[PDB]
Write an enzyme that holds these catalytic residues in place. Structure first.
Site, PDB file in Angstrom:
ATOM      1  N   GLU A   1     -28.005  67.643  51.171  1.00  0.00           N
ATOM      2  CA  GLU A   1     -27.191  66.912  50.224  1.00  0.00           C
ATOM      3  C   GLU A   1     -27.115  65.418  50.586  1.00  0.00           C
ATOM      4  OE1 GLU A   1     -23.158  66.499  51.086  1.00  0.00           O
ATOM      5  OE2 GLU A   1     -23.323  64.935  49.523  1.00  0.00           O
TER       6      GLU A   1
ATOM      7  N   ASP B   1     -25.089  69.158  55.096  1.00  0.00           N
ATOM      8  CA  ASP B   1     -23.989  68.412  54.546  1.00  0.00           C
ATOM      9  C   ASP B   1     -24.080  66.912  54.868  1.00  0.00           C
ATOM     10  OD1 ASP B   1     -21.314  68.305  53.279  1.00  0.00           O
ATOM     11  OD2 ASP B   1     -20.589  67.737  55.263  1.00  0.00           O
TER      12      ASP B   1
END
Ligand SMILES: OC[C@H]1O[C@@H]2O[C@H]3[C@H](O)[C@@H](O)[C@@H](O[C@H]4[C@H](O)[C@@H](O)[C@@H](O[C@H]5[C@H](O)[C@@H](O)[C@@H](O[C@H]6[C@H](O)[C@@H](O)[C@@H](O[C@H]7[C@H](O)[C@@H](O)[C@@H](O[C@H]8[C@H](O)[C@@H](O)[C@@H](O[C@H]1[C@H](O)[C@H]2O)O[C@@H]8CO)O[C@@H]7CO)O[C@@H]6CO)O[C@@H]5CO)O[C@@H]4CO)O[C@@H]3CO
Ligand code: CA
Ligand code: CA
Ligand code: NA
Ligand code: NA
Length: 481
Positions: free
Chosen positions: A259, A229
């Site tokens: 990400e 993340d």
């Protein structure tokens, strides 16, 4: 043989604690449709029961301890998750855990901290003298105690926060003696700070603890890999080391996808380089191209899809996708690929040879926000394209990006997958025809559109060419009857 990822959540799923059970019950369906890996939402206690998971209160509470008004997470209990994972592994479906290590939210208590304000558009610029604030930085985990880990968090494990409890004020505060981590995104001068209490990756006890937790998490859930993340906010060399560390301790491959949210290939390539290419990134630019094509009514030059994407230059390090929980309607990076174009985008990611494609739960089953702009369930339009990938998208590829609207590609088939081979056409504008080469080895076969959009059969000529059709604003994928 082709692997397909699924992001197994969307932002607005109901907080009924049944998601893990649902996942378990969906495992047969996933396996049958060719899904070989799932990315599950963060599995640890957020700031409340209804946290989607990015609050990251307690990384050692997988829905096991009564903390933040609940035992379960939004999604269910640890045991339920472990039963779901067990069902998925029974069908050769790998599980990638979401890793939220930028920050910690929901501290149990405030601490008095000396800090300075920084400019939210340029966090290298200090905009106050020293001031005493009350920051949400003390984590004691009263419901967990020391079970699994006696590590407690205090203000000195963080670089800063966005809330002073004493003045009730929302500003970016950098704590005394701290420096924003580098290397991170150079956006806003330095983009280390995102939200909640920002973890200090200059702190050697913090680096040790997060690595240790990484291994524990992998073991506890028998994970096969990770989704990272918010990586543009986290020291790149730390992420690199973290991935290497967990791999070394577990002895497994641990496929990892980060990400890194920027619509810029150059920035993504910098990140890949700075992490020694030891993990993949989501193909953010490709998503934005799909979004652009979907909102321009035929005006987009479809030839652009071949350039400026991660998959175009680093296909072995790209996870391609259409939409996710941040790009879905209502959400923080909203840039939804419009419904009409969405199957065409899915054909592009699922039937072409480059990249590791991912399907979105929100696209399959629809999103459950409170708007009238939600993504409808497109499961029936996506299933045929998944089948094309699973059974037909093999062998040498030929590209036909030779037109502003109608573009296509073929796959010759491979002798290892019986009857494989396809011919795909998508158009953002008027339909029409394209003659495409599918391989002389397919001469005389009769092919039909697996999507059912076109009802015509195409017989491949002696020279390996067929005349393929596509409807306006549509997709067709021809395969052997
Ligand atoms: O389904 C598998 C795969 O399919 C697609 O990949 C195809 C690709 O699109 C084509 O371009 C072609 O690949 C050629 C490639 O592009 C060329 O660059 C060259 O490759 C050589 C490398 O340049 C050279 O460095 C070396 O490579 C070694 C790596 O450096 C090393 O790290 C390791 O690789 C591992 C990966 O780092 C790791 O991430 C993991 O890879 C997985 C992917 O991340 C995942 O997306 C998926 O890959 C898809 C891919 O995305 C599609 O684009 O599964 C991968 C496998 O699990 O694991 C890797 C292996 O452990 O090892 C390699 C070498 O062993 O050598 C290579 C040449 O061997 O030539 C390529 C042609 O072979 O074809 C591929 C295959 O369909
Ligand atoms: Ca950070
Ligand atoms: Ca720091
Ligand atoms: Na930091
Ligand atoms: Na166009």
């Amino acid at each position: 043989l082709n692997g397909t990822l699924m992001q197994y959540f969307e932002w607005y799923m109901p907080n009924d604690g049944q998601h893990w059970k649902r996942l378990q019950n969906d495992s047969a369906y996933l396996a049958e449709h060719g899904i070989t890996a799932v990315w599950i939402p963060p599995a640890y206690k957020g700031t409340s029961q209804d946290d989607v998971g990015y609050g990251a209160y307690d990384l050692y509470d997988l829905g096991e301890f009564h903390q933040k008004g609940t035992v379960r997470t939004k999604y269910g209990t640890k045991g339920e998750l472990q039963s779901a994972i067990n069902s998925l592994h029974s069908r050769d479906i790998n599980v990638y855990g979401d890793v939220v290590i930028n920050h910690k939210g929901g501290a149990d208590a405030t601490e008095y901290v000396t800090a300075v304000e920084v400019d939210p558009a340029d966090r290298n610029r200090v905009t106050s003298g020293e001031q005493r604030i009350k920051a949400w930085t003390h984590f004691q985990f009263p419901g967990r105690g020391s079970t699994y880990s006696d590590f407690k968090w205090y203000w000195y494990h963080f670089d800063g926060t966005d809330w002073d409890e004493s003045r009730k004020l929302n500003r970016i505060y950098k704590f005394q003696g701290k420096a924003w981590d580098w290397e991170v995104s150079n956006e806003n001068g330095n983009y280390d700070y995102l939200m909640y209490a920002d973890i200090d990756y200059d702190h050697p006890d913090v680096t040790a603890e997060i690595k240790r937790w990484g291994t524990w998490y992998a073991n506890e859930l028998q994970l096969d890999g990770f989704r990272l993340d918010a990586v543009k906010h986290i020291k790149f060399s730390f992420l690199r080391d973290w991935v290497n560390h967990v791999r070394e301790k577990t002895g497994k491959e641990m496929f990892t996808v980060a990400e890194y949210w920027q619509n810029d290939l150059g920035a993504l390539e910098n990140y890949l380089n700075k992490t020694n290419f030891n993990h993949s990134v989501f193909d953010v630019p490709l998503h934005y191209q799909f979004h652009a094509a979907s909102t321009q009514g035929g005006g987009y030059d479809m030839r652009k899809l071949l350039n400026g994407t991660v998959v175009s230059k680093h296909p072995v390090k790209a996870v391609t996708f259409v939409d996710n929980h941040d790009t879905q309607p209502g959400q923080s990076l909203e840039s939804t690929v419009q419904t009409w174009f969405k199957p065409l985008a899915y054909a592009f990611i699922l039937t072409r040879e480059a990249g590791y494609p991912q399907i979105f739960y929100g696209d399959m089953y629809g999103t459950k926000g409170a708007s009238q702009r939600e993504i409808p369930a497109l499961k029936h339009k996506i299933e045929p394209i998944l089948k094309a990938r699973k059974q037909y998208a093999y062998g040498a590829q030929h590209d036909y990006f030779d037109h502003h609207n109608i573009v296509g590609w073929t796959r010759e088939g491979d002798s290892s997958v019986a009857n494989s081979g396809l011919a795909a056409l998508i158009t953002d504008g008027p339909g029409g025809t394209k003659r495409m080469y599918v391989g002389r080895q397919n001469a005389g076969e009769t092919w039909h559109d697996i999507t059912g959009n076109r009802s015509d059969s195409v017989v491949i000529n002696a020279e390996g060419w067929g005349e393929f059709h596509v409807n306006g604003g549509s997709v067709s994928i021809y395969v052997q009857r």
